[PDB]
C-alpha cells in the first residue's frame, strides 16, 4: 500500500483471526494459533468510528421547501431557481464523491500505518534476539514459550534475559 505493510511485505490476511483487525502468530513448541491486539485494534476502530461520525454529523440540514411556485410568465424566475438547484447539486455531488475517495485512500493507508507501526513496535523490542525473516515474522534464536510471547505482545519483553542464550545460536 503506502506503508508497505498490507498487501506488501505481509502478503496476505488471516481468515483464522476473528477477534480483531491486527494480530500475531505463534509457532513455538506448544502448537500454533492466532491472537489479535487489543491496544491497537481499538485505537483503530475508535478513530474510524470517529471518521464516519464526522462526515455525517458536520452536515447542516435546515428545513426547506423545494417546489415550483412559478407561473408561465415567470419562466425567467423558474430558470433562476433551476440554475440554483442545479448549482448546489453539482457542488455537493462533486464534493461528496471526492470526499469519499480522499477519505478512503486515507482510511486504507491508516490501516497500513497501524500495522506497520505494530510490526515495528515488536521488531524494535527484539532486535538481535531474532531473525527478521522479512515477511512479517521473526525467528527466535531461542525457544520462546507461551508466557514469553505474551510479553512480546503486551509490550513487556525482557531483552537481557535472552541476550546471552541468543548470541550463541546466532554466531555459530
Amino acid at each position: 500500500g503506502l506503508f508497505g505493510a498490507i498487501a506488501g511485505f505481509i502478503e496476505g490476511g488471516w481468515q483464522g483471526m476473528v477477534d480483531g483487525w491486527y494480530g500475531y502468530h505463534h509457532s513455538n513448541d506448544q502448537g500454533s494459533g492466532y491472537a489479535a491486539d487489543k491496544e491497537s485494534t481499538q485505537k483503530a476502530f475508535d478513530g474510524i468510528t470517529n471518521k464516519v461520525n464526522s462526515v455525517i454529523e458536520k452536515m447542516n440540514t435546515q428545513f426547506e421547501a423545494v417546489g415550483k411556485e412559478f407561473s408561465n410568465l415567470e419562466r425567467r424566475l423558474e430558470n433562476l431557481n433551476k440554475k440554483m438547484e442545479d448549482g448546489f447539486l453539482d457542488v455537493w455531488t462533486y464534493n461528496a464523491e471526492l470526499l469519499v475517495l480522499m477519505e478512503n485512500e486515507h482510511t486504507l493507508d491508516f490501516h497500513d500505518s497501524n500495522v506497520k507501526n505494530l510490526y515495528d513496535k515488536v521488531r524494535m523490542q527484539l532486535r538481535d534476539n531474532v531473525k527478521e525473516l522479512g515477511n512479517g515474522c521473526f525467528e527466535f534464536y531461542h525457544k520462546c514459550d507461551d508466557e514469553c510471547m505474551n510479553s512480546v505482545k503486551n509490550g513487556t519483553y525482557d531483552y537481557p534475559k535472552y541476550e546471552e542464550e541468543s548470541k550463541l545460536n546466532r554466531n555459530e
Binding site: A5, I6, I10, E11, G12, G13, W14, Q15, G20, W21, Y22, Y24, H25, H26, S27, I48, T49, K51, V52, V55, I56, M59, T61, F63, E64, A65, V66, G67, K68, E69, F70, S71, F88, L89, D90, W92, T93, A96, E97, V100, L101, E103, N104, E105, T107, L108, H111, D112, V115, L118, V122, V130, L133, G136, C137, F138, E139, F140, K143, C144
Partner: protein, 322 residues
Amino acid sequence: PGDQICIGYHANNSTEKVDTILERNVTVTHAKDILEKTHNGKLCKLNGIPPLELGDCSIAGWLLGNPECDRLLSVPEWSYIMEKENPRDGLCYPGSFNDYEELKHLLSSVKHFEKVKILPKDRWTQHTTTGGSRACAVSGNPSFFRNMVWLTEKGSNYPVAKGSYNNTSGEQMLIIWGVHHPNDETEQRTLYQNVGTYVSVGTSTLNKRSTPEIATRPKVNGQGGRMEFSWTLLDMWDTINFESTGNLIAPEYGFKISKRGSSGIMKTEGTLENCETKCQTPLGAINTTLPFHNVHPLTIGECPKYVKSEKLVLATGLRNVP
C-alpha cells in the same frame, strides 16, 4: 529449529467494494454507505402535523368552493399542501386569480385556518343572490362557488350595493372577491342592468376600483364570461369596504389565518397514509441520518443534501486480501 512470531491483519469473505483516489474496485472487510436512497412509498405527516389534502381540486376551486370540492377534509392546521399536477376542479366558471402563487405560498402551511361568515347571503335584500351558472352545475341544475355570492339584478334594478366587515375574529383574515367580465353587452344588462359599473374594495392598506371588461371570448365551459378573483389580508380590527354598481362577485365567508412560517405545495397523485417523517418526497418519506440522498429532488422538511450520485461508500475496515 527456530521458533517464530508473526504480525498480520484480519480478513474475511466480504465483497464490499469501495473506491479511492488511486484505485477502484478495492475489496475491503467492512464499509458504511452514506447515500440514503430508500423511501417508504407513503406520503406522511410532517413533524406530526399533516398536509391539507385537495384531491382532484385546486387551491382556488378549494377556497372559492367549487362544488366538486365540498368533500375535502377541513383541517385547521397543516404543514404542506398535496395537489395533483393538473387538477380537474378549480374555477368551474372560467376566469383568473391575481397574485395566485403568492397566495399558494401563503397557504402552503398554517398554524390555524378557519372559515368564517362575514357577509351573509341573505343580507343582500336588495339583490338576487340565487344566481348560478351551468359551468358550476350541481346535480343537473345551475349553481355557483359555495363561498361567494353572485349579486345580480332584482326587479330589473341593481341598486348601489354596499357591504362591510370589522375584523373581530382574533386573527388576520384572508378574504377573496371577484369581478365579472361578460362576453357581450346584453349579458351585462341581463345580470346587472346598469352600465359603466365599478367594483370598489377598500381597507386601511388596500384600495382598488375595478371596471368590468366586457368582450367576446372563446366559450370555456360554455362561458364567454370570466371571473377575475383577487384577495387580501384584512388585519385584525381593520374593516373592509365593498361597493359596486354591477359585476361584483362578493364573498360570504372569510378565512381566519395564522402562520408559523411557510412551506410548499407538493405535486402528487397519491394520498396521506398514517405515517410520520422529517422529510417528505413525491415518491415517499425519508428516515435517515445519512448526509446525502438521491430519492428525489422535490423534497419538503429537513432533508439530507441531494446529489446526482449512485453510491457513496466509505471504507470502515482494511483491504481484504487472500
